[PDB]
Amino acid sequence: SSVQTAATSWGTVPSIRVYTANNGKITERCWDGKGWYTGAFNEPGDNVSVTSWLVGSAIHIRVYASTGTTTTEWCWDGNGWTKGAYTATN
Ligand SMILES: OC[C@@]1(O)OC[C@@H](O)[C@@H](O)[C@@H]1O
Ligand SMILES: OC[C@@]1(O)OC[C@@H](O)[C@@H](O)[C@@H]1O
């Protein structure tokens, strides 16, 4: 019933991203040190997890969005959210 969240952060400022699954939709709130704002991520799902890593100064984010038994990976690599190659054990 309650919304479900996932969070990641990078750097020392820091940057933070919080993903919320609410009524089948996952949205994103962002912090880079100057206030919270709404990010570009919008994808369907009831459950969400996230991980991220830096390559130098560039952030890479992977969001795992689940509905039923299907998990979709979404990828941020600097230029829009793209569907990743992740598949389950099937
Ligand atoms: O600067 C904000 C932004 O580009 O940061 C990287 C990702 O979190 C995006 O969804 C988000 O819109
Ligand atoms: O560049 C995207 C990608 O190759 O990044 C590593 C993994 O997240 C993969 O599933 C994904 O397709």
What CATH number is attached to the domain comprising 71? Answer: 2.40.128.190
User: Which residues on adjacent β-strands are paired with residue 27?
Assistant: 20, 42
Instruction: Please indicate, yes or no, if residue 89 is contained in any of the structural domains.
Output: no
Contact at 8 Å (CB) between 51 and 36? Answer: no
- Residue 46 labeled ligand binder: yes
What is the Cα Rg of the chain in Å?
Answer: 13
Cα separations in angstroms, 83 against 4, 38, 80: 21, 20, 10
Report how far residue 20's alpha carbon sits from residue 47's, in angstroms, rounded to the nearest whole number. Answer: 9
Residue 27 Cα to ligand 1 middle (Å): 11
Instruction: Please indicate, yes or no, if residue 19 is contained in any of the structural domains.
Output: yes
Torsion of CA 74, 80, 85, 90, to 10 degrees: 30
Instruction: Please indicate, yes or no, if residue 16 is contained in any of the structural domains.
Output: yes
Instruction: Please indicate, yes or no, if residue 79 is contained in any of the structural domains.
Output: yes
Instruction: Please indicate, yes or no, if residue 5 is contained in any of the structural domains.
Output: yes
Resolution in A: 1.2
Substitution candidate for ligand 1 out of 16, 17, 82 with most atoms within 8 A of CB:
17
From its phi and psi, is residue 10 left (phi > 0), alpha (psi between -120 and 50) or beta? Answer: beta
Contact at 8 Å (CB) between 17 and 53? Answer: no
Q: Where are the beta strands (DSSP E) in the chain?
A: 4-10, 15-22, 25-31, 36-44, 47-55, 58-67, 70-76, 81-83
Substitution candidate for ligand 1 out of 10, 29, 30 with most atoms within 8 A of CB:
30
Contact at 8 Å (CB) between 20 and 65? Answer: no
The count of structural domains within the chain is: 1
Contact at 8 Å (CB) between 59 and 37? Answer: no
Q: Is 44 helix (H, G, I), strand (E, B) or coil?
A: strand
* Residue 38, domain extent: 1-84
Contact at 8 Å (CB) between 63 and 44? Answer: no
Query: Cβ of 47: how many Cβ atoms within 10 Å?
Result: 13
